[PDB]
Amino acid sequence: MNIFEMLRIDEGLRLKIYKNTEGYYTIGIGHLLTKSPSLNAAKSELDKAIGRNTNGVITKDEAEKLFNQDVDAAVRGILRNAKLKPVYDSLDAVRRAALINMVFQMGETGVAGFTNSLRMLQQKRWDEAAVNLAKSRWYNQTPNRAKRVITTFRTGTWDAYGSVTVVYQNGLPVISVRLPSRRERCQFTLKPISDSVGVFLRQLQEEARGIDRVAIYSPDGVRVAASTGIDLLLLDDFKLVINDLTYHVRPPK
Incomplete structure (x- = not known):
């Protein structure tokens, strides 16, 4: 950082x-x-x-x-x-x-x-x-x-x-999130085969009980659909909104 x-x-x-x-x-x-x-x-x-x-x-x-x-x-x-x-x-x-x-x-x-x-x-x-x-x-x-x-x-x-990062472990994407108070990160492992953006997002809310807004957008600023597969999401960088903060996420190609 x-x-x-x-x-x-x-x-x-x-x-x-x-x-x-x-x-x-x-x-x-x-x-x-x-x-x-x-x-x-x-x-x-x-x-x-x-x-x-x-x-x-x-x-x-x-x-x-x-x-x-x-x-x-x-x-x-x-x-x-x-x-x-x-x-x-x-x-x-x-x-x-x-x-x-x-x-x-x-x-x-x-x-x-x-x-x-x-x-x-x-x-x-x-x-x-x-x-x-x-x-x-x-x-x-x-x-x-x-x-x-x-x-x-x-x-x-x-x-x-x-800050949010994406890194593959056991051939599976792992999204760590580090929120504006807790330097204890949290990680989310995902199955790109079957999981969607909405799943990831629901997971995200079911963690911190203080979040009021979570969204994903293209770098161009367009809202990515909830039903979109994580496989497709991770083909390119994206913006994760999490309360007021927006994070540019940059998955490894």
């Missing part, structure tokens, strides 16, 4: 233009297109960023190119900023991920404004930083994300960021 998977989770993946929680036109894995309120400006800014006429739709290959760029833009952006560098330097890989996340979301100068929190951060004053971060305009606008980021700063662990 790392910043790339962390941001996948926070940002999801959309292949058509859409408005983020701040109402700004966005595409892919949280790629901010513009701050203009004009859709046509967004649509034009899209085409330049891709290098073809997009008609407001991109592919997964195009999504992940942008993504890798924006993160290096963020991580580089950190390293050339006065306030943000020594903190970044001080922190371990996990809290550095938390910070890039913050930059990634709201830009460099947006994240310099947290002088106090950054100072507390730098001195290793975890909970103080956390308590303080929870008082920002940030937290109010995007609360549960900020909560996830703030927890990563407090603990320096991935507790708030779950």
Whole structure:
């Protein structure tokens, strides 16, 4: 687990233009297109960023190119900023991920404004930083994300960021799930011959008694049918929604 998977989770993946929680036109894995309120400006800014006429739709290959760029833009952006560098330097890989996340979301100068929190951060004053971060305009606008980021700063662990993987054992797919509180994973072994997406999903609910929503979608964002066989599901990556979090699952070919 790392910043790339962390941001996948926070940002999801959309292949058509859409408005983020701040109402700004966005595409892919949280790629901010513009701050203009004009859709046509967004649509034009899209085409330049891709290098073809997009008609407001991109592919997964195009999504992940942008993504890798924006993160290096963020991580580089950190390293050339006065306030943000020594903190970044001080922190371990996990809290550095938390910070890039913050930059990634709201830009460099947006994240310099947290002088106090950054100072507390730098001195290793975890909970103080956390308590303080929870008082920002940030937290109010995007609360549960900020909560996830703030927890990563407090603990320096991935507790708030779950994850799902698929790995074959005894020639059978085994889906481990690691939820946003319990670093005790859970695994589900499946029979692709006979089991379906709905079976897997009913299993999933019959585990945690706190889940209120579970779904599977294509990478393109389309709901996969419950009656679909797991054999077919595992021919390609997919998105597992589990309460608010969406996880990009990537079965081994």
